[PDB]
């Protein structure tokens, strides 16, 4: 494997969110999103109609994979995970199983995940990938629709308003439609997957975390999965910040905690919150004495831009670092 | 002209900054514009190869002419002035004379001054243009490059850097291949226009001020028109802050400014003076006869942000409650 | 007691949080308290000798009890809750029972409580108390101790720092010798207290809860007291906002919040909640029949920061606007 | 002199503003002052009874000269300037000639000036001098009461509410009796005093502008003078943002620009407008180049603290230089 000493070694990676929900920026007709401007469609409960048509305004005229991986790599960053799909269900990949996607869809009519592959292959850094395997607010059998007893940073889990037949939905249709397939998808093109990054299954069943789990082992063997998947089909388990040194058996000694800059992971133009160069740095140094990677996420702005307060925080938070291992 | 005594009266109108410089929104390469985000095009010297294709990307799907015109009225604004072309040279209308325009060049294919002039026709509120008359950054003979003397918002006053040869310009090809014809199409369509906003001239000679003034008699004889377009050719004083104690024939007065710190829309600047800072300042030039005239700088979705209105609706709040008393 | 009909009405009250903490506002040496910076003194284990210290400089010129309940009644809340005594043990009443109050230990010398109390009975608002009657960092067996299994805004629940045997801590000492005693004297002076407010024990006995219950049954029959005592002693559930729909025998309910993110004043925190998110908020607790107990905190010189104002008179406004439609 | 040696080659200074103004942080009676808080007393036009008040409210248990100077000089500050006394005429040092003074007015009855002056010596820090020598609100003929022609960051320059007589007022006996004999005080006391800060004469006379220089030579031979005291009566001339390479003769090479992190020189609770490492290290390089000292200022709030984001900002900035020099 040898992936796994490399990932003990990692200690940082750059997290990516970018979506049709990055467009909004955090707002919906003169109202404000929760803390997760990427949760906007549950929240405001749009239309997929309405909220799909942003895919008609997608060109972001200033993305350039080969600047954000070099921004990684000044930052001392190994890895970067992108998100391929969020609950909303549209696709940063030229998916064949659903034209609802960056490329099918979009002016713009390019694969982020493939330029992204090819700019971490290059620069010499490793390269994982977000899926939403249960929630799909696209999708008519979409997950989250027996588990809306428990609050959200939208509405509901489900898309309830397109499709308010609860007692109707069946998410092996989506499951074995869209979902199985677009794994498949992004684990056998774009190259070796280092990081495989799932959400925790409310519907998906026994049986099909099992699938999902043997789909990446076979196309993507060496490729490390984190514990939300399910429980024994995981490489590393994520932590939240309720559970990082002031339980998940974890067999390889592998962990990682994901976090934002601002208190969102889509992009938002309300929200200016930008974690300090000092608190970046900190919470880096403390996770990695304890043995965990730090996976910051930077939510791209309309034009594919990391916010200019992310990268000056990010380089500042380098720079205190650096100083602080001279002394 | 009942349009003096309907101005002496107003107090309150919307402005509106929106252009390609909205989609870059106060960033550029990593870095910030000056608080004027609309001229980010001059801080960074983008080349218009470069500037021009941001076109490409402008399809503002949350535009609504008549929702805008709506808060505008809710707030007891009378009038509502829009930028038809800024210092980036790109026209906000569908210009015969020039193809750099949101109908030609841009997937949104719509006249926003258009949908705007009919949205204010319809809601009772008189419709005013703002024109770059001397600065244009897409033209080779644009206005300013006799005098970058003095500093800007930007780099310099001109495009110096697709046009760099300063001692071959010459802006009489701009003014009248371009300026003045555009300013013949905007006065000509979209119905009556109340108020005309033109910039201070730097390069436009004292023959073409005259022009522009006849020109917009000719066409628009109720439209006043404001201070900066050189003296003894407007019917209103724009006045400055900084110019109103404690040389207008007609006793009409306007002092401009923004809700933030830009006229155009920009997404690090979120220093949004309070709804009592807006009401008082309102009721201070109010007293003294001045009308405000409010900007908002719409976002690349053509959506007003979240707090303008928040603060446009509650300092009305203010308004009326302290009017009940 | 009529006063069970009053509460169901009342609709709107201010909270007050102001303390030693107050004069920190979020900061200790160059580095930032959680959320609360009242809990600042636990989050940086800052020993009693240092903390009590600050005593020493509270002198808040600016602190006027008629202004504050003016503000309150302006915004039309009917009622004002105050900090008798925080988690970090500091009276701000004059204690016969501790020399560790607003009273004895500082150059201001005059009782907060009272003035707030008398502001009230004369501008015709019902007066309530908070009293932090299991947490007291100042208290050698101050409770918390035996519950640090749960994580807190500070450090530990107790004052661990000063006081570090916890096998040989002892709540009873604390509750008969500083806490009963000192709810007797909120409680006796200081006239009506209509709100009685506690925290929910973790050290504090089932025989230490009913005996609070009993001790202001007998001196305010008429105070109606909050869950968060203990189950069965209480007369208004005090709700959550992760506990409203889309175990109160009386119907009475009360959901607390602060205009910013902290109860004490902290500089650092400047996330004011808009008016519009002010109004919207009250009036949905309203609707489902809840009290809303809206937070301020107090700054070093006694004052309503400028924003908290300003964000409750534009509140109001909207909210009196919205019922003229 | 060679202190016209080491000031060609300082490159960077701490400037401190702190005051009575201090202690209202930018606010009186739920209203913000200017961008300039220290303005705050002309502002809102409080009497000296009340304005002066704020003394018996002035305890700052956490000023301390030593841990000021350490931050100064990690920064690789080398000289720190300190406002003995500010337009609202309230000197921050134990002055003979007035009682209206920290050490006498105030519970925390200390010399700060002396506290730095000595913190300063022992880390081998220069240590130089601002005082208000025309603006005194507190003196009924304080300065500014023939130039209210133009705009300030308060209402007047002069205290034109306690003292409205405008023309029965006469400068000499402000001049006089407390401006030079103050001057006097701070010149022999606390040592060796590297830099004086005078503003701008409004009123001061030309006779007036030469005494001060001639009093600054006689006491402290070796002290660097700036441009604003009078047209040659100065060693340094200080630039305004102005007047910085993208005039007053220099006649030694000697420059200063300074600023502050946020928009006030004086500490306020609302202005959080902190500008970032990267802005802050830029400016001190673009300074530099052009051989330009820069001047930082830091608004010390009512406990005597540097803020915690003007800290954060400065150690950022430092760290950014310093890997810049590494490269
Ligand atoms: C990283 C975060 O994990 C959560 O489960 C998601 O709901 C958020 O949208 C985000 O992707
Ligand atoms: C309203 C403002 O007037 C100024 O002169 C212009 O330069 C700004 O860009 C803006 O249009
Ligand atoms: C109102 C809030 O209730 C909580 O329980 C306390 O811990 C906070 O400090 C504050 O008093
Ligand atoms: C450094 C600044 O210089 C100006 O002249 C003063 O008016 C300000 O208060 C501040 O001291």
Same mark, same amino acid.
């Given at each position: 494997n040898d992936n796994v000493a490399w990932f003990k070694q990692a200690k940082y990676g750059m997290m990516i969110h970018w979506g049709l929900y990055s467009l909004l920026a955090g707002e919906y007709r003169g109202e404000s999103s929760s803390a997760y401007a990427e949760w906007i469609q549950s929240k405001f409960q749009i239309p997929n109609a309405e909220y799909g048509n942003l895919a008609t305004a997608f *060109? /972001?005229?200033?993305?350039?994979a080969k600047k954000i991986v070099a921004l990684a790599k000044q930052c001392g960053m190994q890895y970067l995970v992108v998100t391929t799909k969020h609950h909303d269900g549209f696709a940063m990949y030229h998916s064949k199983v659903d034209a609802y996607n960056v490329y099918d869809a979009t002016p713009f009519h390019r694969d982020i995940i493939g330029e992204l592959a090819e700019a971490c292959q290059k620069a010499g850094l490793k390269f994982g990938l977000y899926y939403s395997q249960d929630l799909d607010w696209h999708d008519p059998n979409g997950g989250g629709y027996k588990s809306n007893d428990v609050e959200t940073?939208?509405?509901?889990?489900? *898309?309830?308003?397109?499709? /308010?037949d609860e007692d109707q939905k069946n998410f092996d249709l989506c499951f074995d439609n869209k979902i199985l397939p677009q794994i498949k998808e992004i684990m056998s093109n774009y190259?070796?997957?280092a990081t495989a990054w799932f959400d925790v299954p409310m519907t998906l069943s026994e049986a099909q975390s099992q699938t999902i789990y043997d789909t990446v082992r076979e196309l993507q063997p060496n490729c490390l999965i984190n514990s939300?998947?399910?429980?024994?089909?995981?490489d590393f388990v994520s932590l939240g910040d309720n559970e990082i040194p002031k339980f998940k058996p974890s067999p390889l000694g592998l962990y990682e905690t994901a976090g934002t800059? *601002?208190?969102?992971?889509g992009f938002s133009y309300?929200?200016?919150n930008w974690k300090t160069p000092r608190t970046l740095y900190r919470y880096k140094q403390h996770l990695n004495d304890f043995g965990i990677n730090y996976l910051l996420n930077v939510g791209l702005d309309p034009l594919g831009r990391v916010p200019m307060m992310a990268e000056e925080n990010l380089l500042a938070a380098k720079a205190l670092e650096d100083e602080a291992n001279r002394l």
């Open positions: *060109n /972001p005229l200033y993305f350039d940073a939208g509405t509901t889990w489900d *898309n309830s308003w397109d499709f /308010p190259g070796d997957i939300r998947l399910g429980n024994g089909k995981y800059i *601002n208190d969102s992971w309300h929200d200016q």
